C-alpha cells in the first residue's frame, strides 16, 4: 500500500454520469468522491445546511427545475 496511489484530489470540473448528472465514481474514473447518507446524517445533526447545499447541489448534480 503506497500513499501516492491512495491519495486523490479533484476540482470542480470532471466527468459526470449521463443519467443522474452526478460526478463519476472514484479516482479511476477521474470523478468525485462520495458523501454517503451517513455523512448527510452527520451534517444534518450539526445543522450544516449551507454546506449540504454547497456539496450536494453545486458540487454534485444541481438544477433549476
Amino acid at each position: 500500500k503506497f500513499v501516492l496511489d491512495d491519495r486523490y484530489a479533484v476540482a470542480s470540473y470532471g466527468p459526470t454520469d449521463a443519467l443522474t448528472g452526478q460526478p463519476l465514481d472514484g479516482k479511476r474514473s477521474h470523478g468525485g468522491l462520495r458523501l454517503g447518507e451517513m455523512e448527510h446524517w452527520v451534517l444534518t445533526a450539526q445543522g450544516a445546511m449551507q454546506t449540504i447545499i454547497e456539496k450536494s447541489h453545486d458540487d454534485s448534480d444541481g438544477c433549476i427545475s
Partner: protein, 336 residues
C-alpha cells in the same frame, strides 16, 4: 377591452441591499420591465397601475446566493379581445401563398390570420390597412408573447341577426353593473363627438348594411348620425334612457330586445317588441335581462370604438384613396 386586472407573482431580487433602499420605486420598475408589453394569464399587460400588496424581501434558502425574492400583488391595465371585435386598423404584412394575415395598429397589439377561403380576403393587398373583425374563435393569449394571436376576416356587415327574449324582469341592483358599462359607452360617445361629422358619415354609410345616401340625420344629443330604414314603422328606444329609468325601477325588460340590420349599430336605439315581430333568423334566445343588456351594450361599444378608430386611422384622404378598393369590396357585398 381595456380593463383593470389584479395579478400576483414572485420577483427575484439580485441585489437586495440596493433594492430595499427604495422598495416601491424598484418594485414598480421591475414590474414594468418584466410584465408590461407581454401576455400573461390570458391578458395583455399595457401598464402597471399600482402595487396592492407585497411581502418582505425574503432570502432564498435553497440556493447559496444572497439573492432574495418578493411576492408582489399588483393591479394593471390589460386588454382582452372577445369574439366579433372590430379592429379598424390592420396592416397586411404578407398576403401570399393562399394565407393572409395582418398586424393591428391600435393600442392592443394583435396578429390576425385571415383565411384565403373568402374571396374578399384574397382581394386585400399587402401594406394596406384593412378593417377586420375577429372570428367567433377565442383569442389565444400565449404567455410571454408581445402580441395576442387571433383569426379574423375583413369586416363585412352580415344581414343575419338575432332576437333575444327576456324572461326575468330587470335585475335589481344589477343596474349598477350595467351602469359601469354605460359609463364606458358615454366616454366613447364623447370621444366620437370631437372628430368631424363628415368622416363619420362616410364610414357609417360605407359600413351600413342598407346604404342610404339620403343624408337624413337622426339627431340624438349624445349621438348624431345618418338615418336608416323603417321596419313595420316601429319605434326604437334609446338604451341609455332605459338604463336611466333604473331610478324609476321599472323598465319593461321582459319585451324582446333586438337591433335590426337597418338600425345603426353605433346608435343606442334598439327595438322592443312584445311578440316576435322581428323576423327570427334563429329562434329567440332564452336569456336573462343581465345577459341581453350586457350583450347589446357590448355590441354598441364595439361598433362605436370601431367607428372612432376608423375615423382616426384614415384621417388622410389619400389613404382613403388607396383603400377605396377595400371600400368597394364592402359596397359590393352590401345588399338592400
Amino acid at each position: 377591452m381595456i380593463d383593470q386586472k389584479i395579478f400576483e407573482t414572485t420577483l427575484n431580487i439580485d441585489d437586495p441591499t440596493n433594492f430595499c433602499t427604495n422598495v416601491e420605486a424598484h418594485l414598480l420598475k421591475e414590474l414594468e420591465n418584466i410584465y408590461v408589453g407581454k401576455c400573461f394569464k390570458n391578458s395583455f399587460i399595457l401598464n402597471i397601475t399600482g402595487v396592492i400588496q407585497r411581502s418582505p424581501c425574503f432570502i432564498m434558502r435553497t440556493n447559496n446566493s444572497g439573492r432574495g425574492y418578493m411576492h408582489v400583488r399588483f393591479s394593471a391595465v390589460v386588454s382582452y379581445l372577445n369574439a366579433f371585435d372590430l379592429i379598424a386598423a390592420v396592416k397586411i404584412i404578407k398576403n401570399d401563398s393562399n394565407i393572409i394575415l395582418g398586424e393591428s395598429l391600435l393600442t392592443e397589439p394583435v396578429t390576425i390570420v385571415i383565411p384565403s377561403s373568402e374571396s374578399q380576403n384574397n382581394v386585400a393587398e399587402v401594406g394596406q390597412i384593412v378593417p377586420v373583425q375577429l372570428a367567433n374563435s377565442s383569442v389565444y393569449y400565449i404567455p410571454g408573447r408581445q402580441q395576442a394571436s387571433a383569426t379574423g376576416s375583413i369586416f363585412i356587415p352580415k344581414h343575419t341577426f338575432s332576437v333575444y327574449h327576456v324572461q326575468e324582469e330587470l335585475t335589481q341592483e344589477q343596474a349598477l353593473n350595467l351602469t359601469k358599462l354605460v359609463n364606458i359607452i358615454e366616454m366613447l360617445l364623447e370621444s366620437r363627438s370631437k372628430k368631424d361629422f363628415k368622416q363619420i358619415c362616410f364610414f357609417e354609410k360605407l359600413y351600413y348594411t342598407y346604404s342610404i345616401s339620403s343624408d337624413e340625420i337622426l339627431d340624438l344629443k349624445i349621438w348624431k348620425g345618418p338615418k336608416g330604414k323603417e321596419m313595420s314603422r316601429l319605434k326604437p328606444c334609446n338604451v341609455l334612457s332605459f338604463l336611466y329609468d333604473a331610478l324609476k325601477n321599472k323598465s319593461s325588460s321582459l319585451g324582446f330586445w333586438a337591433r335590426p340590420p337597418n338600425l345603426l349599430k353605433s346608435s343606442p336605439l334598439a327595438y322592443q317588441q312584445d311578440q316576435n315581430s322581428f323576423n327570427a333568423t334563429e329562434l329567440p334566445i332564452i336569456c336573462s335581462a343581465e345577459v341581453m343588456f350586457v350583450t347589446l351594450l357590448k355590441e354598441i361599444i364595439n361598433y362605436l370604438q370601431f367607428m372612432n378608430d376608423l375615423c382616426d386611422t384614415f384621417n388622410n384622404e389619400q389613404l382613403i384613396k388607396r383603400h377605396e378598393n377595400i371600400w368597394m369590396l364592402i359596397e359590393q357585398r352590401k345588399i338592400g
